[PDB]
Amino acid sequence: MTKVLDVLEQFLNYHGYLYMRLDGATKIEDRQILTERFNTDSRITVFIL
DNA sequence: TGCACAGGATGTATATATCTGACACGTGCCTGGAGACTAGGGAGTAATCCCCTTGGCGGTTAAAACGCGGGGGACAGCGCGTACGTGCGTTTAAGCGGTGCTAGAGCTGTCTACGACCAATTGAGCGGCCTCGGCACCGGGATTCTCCAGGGCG
């Protein structure tokens, strides 16, 4: 359920990590970019889907 | 001579007998009130089936919702003048009293077409079905149609 996603964002934001969320509420243009951004070497530890 | 008075000669509200109009009461013939027989139309039930819901997750889209620029159109202010508002005298014609009529309005027998009421047939009209040619939606392309920037012109 999507109601866990916002709570998980408030948690990951509480502990201060670098994350990116991908779900049905995003657009098509921000999808592939958030993908390649995670695949390439970066500081993002967790990727929410 | 100038003056007050006693009585007639006219008004005038005042009180009395008199003329319509409308409320009030006493009838009798077309109405209602009521009694009995028929019966089909209304109250009641047994499936039924059939479309209409129950509850809520997500993903995504098209429609709803908000936000700012400003352009033009609503809108306040104000002067003008002629178009009705207001006030006179002069006229044509309706109101109304009264009249001689009639021709059409209005209540009543005859019968006779002629439509109300009831069996027998059916065929034209209604439930069921399954197709295809007209219809729905959109590309291609030409056509028009409005928006904006000089500039030749004030």
UniProtKB/Swiss-Prot annotation:
Protein family: Belongs to the SNF2/RAD54 helicase family. SWR1 subfamily.
Subcellular location: Nucleus
Disulfide bonds: none
Role this protein plays: Catalytic component of the SWR1 complex which mediates the ATP-dependent exchange of histone H2A for the H2A variant HZT1 leading to transcriptional regulation of selected genes by chromatin remodeling.
Origin species: Saccharomyces cerevisiae (strain ATCC 204508 / S288c) (Baker's yeast)
Whole-protein coverage range: 1271 to 1319 of 1514
Protein name: Helicase SWR1
Subunit structure: Component of the SWR1 chromatin-remodeling complex composed of at least ACT1, ARP4, RVB1, RVB2, ARP6, YAF9, VPS71, VPS72, SWC3, SWC4, SWC5, SWC7 and SWR1, and perhaps BDF1.
Other known facts: Present with 656 molecules/cell in log phase SD medium.
